[PDB]
Design a protein around this ligand. Structure first.
Ligand SMILES: [Ca+2]
Ligand SMILES: [Zn+2]
Lengths: 320, 368, 160, 47
DNA sequence: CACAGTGATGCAAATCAAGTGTGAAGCCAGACAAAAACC
DNA sequence: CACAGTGATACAGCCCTTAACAAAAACCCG
């Protein structure tokens, strides 16, 4: 490399002094293009296709969202993915998989707290911060020694932020759904979503050693799916997106994980009341979201169908 | 060749998988007897095998050490665990092991148990039942697996930790001054100790003792947290000295090569064993009068002999088979056909391939 | 492909004459190494090593032995490996991994019952046949209703 | 949601940190990632 | 009418080795010559 | 002294640029 500087330390000046005059000074792609045309004069047309496939990231390389989907969808943990990537790069010499810091940096595009969105009217008792991700589901419950002893751990998404993330990753599906129903792509009609909610506790999740509160060995998960999306065209209502396999494990999107007991009512109400406040606020407004170059408008309908008979009787206030 | 990780989950190779009770004897012998036949066959031969263009000859030495105490009692033809006859290496009674507590010698072997079962079955002196059981020293069955007398290290950890747990629970109640106690007083002592262990040592309480609990429990920090709850101070200095002795004597029977890495702790084992025994017989005679745990008898009496004979304990422990049990549930749920006529074959094949070292030089070839 | 000539017609000739009078006449090599230097001052070493991969022999294709070692050492299943292989081949074109049956036909070197051997005293009550692997563990127990009832399932290797 | 409970039992021990403090966020992030249609459509590369 | 695995098996479909001698196509040469999106 | 993870974080190390001196091998011929 130092002698490839020493031998080309005049032609390098020639190419940087021609780069500023012919196009403006783009030093990489002009010699790339000369290398393409030199393969043309040397008459290799498949090799230049492999070259442009590499320089678009296609012929190998594997753009890191695809490697993230591979690390996620085959239940690969990060340590096992690191082993696989490390020994594949050690054997083949090439870098087929991306290192996992690139996976981490490409991961935050889909986690909650990324996109801009505007409620119209603004939501009551909801801040307009658009970068709120995993927050403590206690929501600042007072843990002092003077008052009620809380012993649960919880983590949750803010409800509107999670609905924005779940509407933004299935953007392509909504566009293809309105395409297949002879609609436009620039349409920004008021979408009526319907969101199916479900909550069920679990048992025998073992408590760990170490520092923290006296956590019970039960967990409670709150989750939602997106069943249908219906836009109004003309007079009547057409649907755009439909969950094709509605009872999958691929579409029950998690919203809140707490280490509580659903038998207990105090800690359950304490953790769960922020989400009900957000949902009650969101029942009567509109969301504006930029979906593929166009701002479009959504409004929601929440259906709590996914509760068993015991939880319905214990929450809706009936007898046991 | 000398294996670097003798208790790994990567070096234990599966050989026979079956679905039967550990304690049901007949089907156990029905499956395991071909394996014993092949082993007693090939214990006297020379395997010729081509290794990279040259034939070479191998001989074999089989060492059965990865057996827990219950299975040694079951298949070596000895009595059950709670008998008067405790040790599977020496001939001594439970009351004799609480009077001498150190000086023994290894006497039980496999040929000796076979001849003793022949003595029991033939009854060649015409004695009664009890005089015959004294004559045969507790052998009442035919031993069908040859094993080496040794000490399982992992269960020695767990047993000694549970015995110290009971000592801690019995010292906060001052049972040496309250020799009678109800059920509920003992329950409350247990609950108090559980709360203070969670508050101090960050340990959640469990009913089945583990190994990580056993390593986190046998510290000096735990005896400080427990000494916070004793009213006296003679009990403080007694617990302090006793936990110091147990930590001086632990890393001889847990290290992979105690002749090299911890030699001065290996050398002081007899002196510290006599100190542990005299402390048990003096300052804890409310727990060790007329009885002892058989793991204390093994730990205090037979460890230097096993070290002198076999070089190391704990390299031969059953830790690797238990980590194989951790692999087995994973391979049964994730890497097998879900049919009752196919699952054992697929699981045996995968657990063979996972421990295969030819597929393990590849994953650390980046370290070349 | 055509309409970039009136902008590079000038630079090509001072590439040509310099590489003629300095190196000996190579042109593809001297625009190869200049793009290497541009990529490395650009600090894009991954595309540099991929260009090295297009120049030298391709590292496409792993051995079936190393895909087997990967698939069994990272606790992958065969269905998970199958859809990983399918996605990698359907996206990147070329076949980096190996299909399942190649791993199957290259795992038989590692299971027992593949290699030849003998015992110099032949062992009592076991055959000298050397291609037995996963055999039944019951060893032919009498499974009739007229016998001591058995209810277990057992699979074993031969010990030798 | 019951199949989600199966996924939760898997994700608690496979791909999350073992601590009482920051394991719920790891499980919640991974189970958020697993249910993304944008990543699931990459495993359908045959149209 | 839950739904994504769990791995071996077996049948079909796709690719390919090979002859040698063809076609199809990209592209070198420098120069001559119309479309077209801004002032 | 069981041991192979489980993920995030932090930091370090190695590799470009400037431009001028330097240790050093490869032939030429007095
Ligand atoms: Ca439940
Ligand atoms: Zn003994």
């Amino acid at each position: 490399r130092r002698a490839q500087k020493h031998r080309l330390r005049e032609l390098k000046i020639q190419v940087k002094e021609f780069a500023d005059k012919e196009e403006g000074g783009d030093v990489k792609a002009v010699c790339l293009t000369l290398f393409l045309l030199a393969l043309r004069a040397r008459n290799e047309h498949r090799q230049a296709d492999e070259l442009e496939a590499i320089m678009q990231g296609r012929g190998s390389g594997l753009q890191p969202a695809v490697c993230l989907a591979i690390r996620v969808n085959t239940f690969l943990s990060c340590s096992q993915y690191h082993k696989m990537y490390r020994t594949v790069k050690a054997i083949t010499g090439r870098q087929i998989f991306q290192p996992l810091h690139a996976l981490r940096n490409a991961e935050k595009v889909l986690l909650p707290g990324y996109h801009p969105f505007e409620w119209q009217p603004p939501l009551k008792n909801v801040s307009s911060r658009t970068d709120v991700g995993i927050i403590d589901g206690l929501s600042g419950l007072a843990s002092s020694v003077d008052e009620y002893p809380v012993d649960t751990i919880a983590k949750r998404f803010r409800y509107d932020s999670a609905l924005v993330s779940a509407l933004m990753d299935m953007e392509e599906d909504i566009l293809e759904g309105m395409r297949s129903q002879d609609l436009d792509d620039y349409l920004n009609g008021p979408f009526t979503v319907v969101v199916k909610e479900s909550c069920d506790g679990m048992g025998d999740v073992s408590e760990k050693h170490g520092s923290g509160p006296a956590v019970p060995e039960k967990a409670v998960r709150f989750s939602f799916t997106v069943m249908r999306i219906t836009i109004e065209h003309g007079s009547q209502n057409v649907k755009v997106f439909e969950e094709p396999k509605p009872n999958s494990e691929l579409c029950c999107k998690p919203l809140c994980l707490m280490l509580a007991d659903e038998s207990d009512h105090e800690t359950l109400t304490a953790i769960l009341s922020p989400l009900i406040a957000e949902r009650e606020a969101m029942k009567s407004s509109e969301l504006t979201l930029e979906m593929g170059g166009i701002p479009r408008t959504f409004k929601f309908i929440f259906r709590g169908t996914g509760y068993d008979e015991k939880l319905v009787r214990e929450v809706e206030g009936l007898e046991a | 060749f000398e294996e670097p990780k003798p208790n790994s989950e990567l070096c234990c190779k599966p050989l026979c998988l079956m679905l039967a009770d550990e304690s049901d004897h007949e089907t156990l012998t029905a499956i395991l007897s071909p394996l014993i036949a092949e082993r007693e066959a090939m214990k006297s031969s020379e395997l010729t095998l081509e290794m990279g263009g040259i034939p070479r000859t191998f001989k074999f030495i089989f060492r059965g050490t990865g057996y827990d105490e219950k299975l040694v009692r079951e298949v070596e033809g000895l009595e059950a665990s709670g008998s008067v006859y405790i040790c599977t290496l020496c001939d001594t009674t439970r009351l004799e092991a609480s009077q001498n507590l150190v000086f023994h010698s290894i006497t039980r072997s496999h040929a000796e148990n076979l001849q003793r079962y022949e003595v029991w079955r033939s009854n060649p002196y015409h004695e009664s039942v009890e005089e015959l059981r004294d004559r045969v020293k507790g052998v009442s069955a035919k031993p069908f697996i040859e094993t080496v007398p040794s000490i399982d290290a992992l269960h020695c950890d767990i047993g000694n930790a549970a015995e110290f747990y009971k000592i801690f629970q019995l010292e906060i109640g001052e049972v040496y001054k309250h020799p009678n106690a109800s059920k509920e007083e003992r329950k409350r002592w247990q609950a108090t100790l559980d709360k203070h262990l969670r508050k101090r040592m960050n340990l959640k309480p469990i009913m089945r003792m583990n190994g990580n609990f056993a390593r986190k429990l046998m510290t000096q920090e735990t005896v400080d947290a427990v000494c916070e709850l004793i009213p006296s101070e003679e009990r403080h200095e007694a617990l302090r000295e006793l936990m110091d002795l147990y930590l001086k004597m632990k890393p001889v029977w847990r290290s992979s090569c105690p002749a090299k890495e911890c030699p001065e702790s290996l050398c002081q084992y007899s002196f510290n064993s006599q100190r542990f025994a005299e402390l048990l017989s003096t300052k804890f005679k409310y727990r060790y009068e007329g009885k002892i745990t058989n793991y204390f008898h093994k730990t205090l009496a037979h460890v230097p002999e096993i070290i002198e004979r076999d070089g190391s304990i704990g390299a031969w422990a059953s830790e690797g088979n238990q980590s194989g049990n951790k692999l087995f549930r994973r391979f049964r749920k994730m890497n097998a056909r879900q049919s009752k006529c196919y699952e054992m074959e697929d699981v045996l094949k995968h657990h063979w391939l996972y421990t295969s070292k030819y597929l393990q030089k590849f994953m650390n070839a980046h370290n070349a």
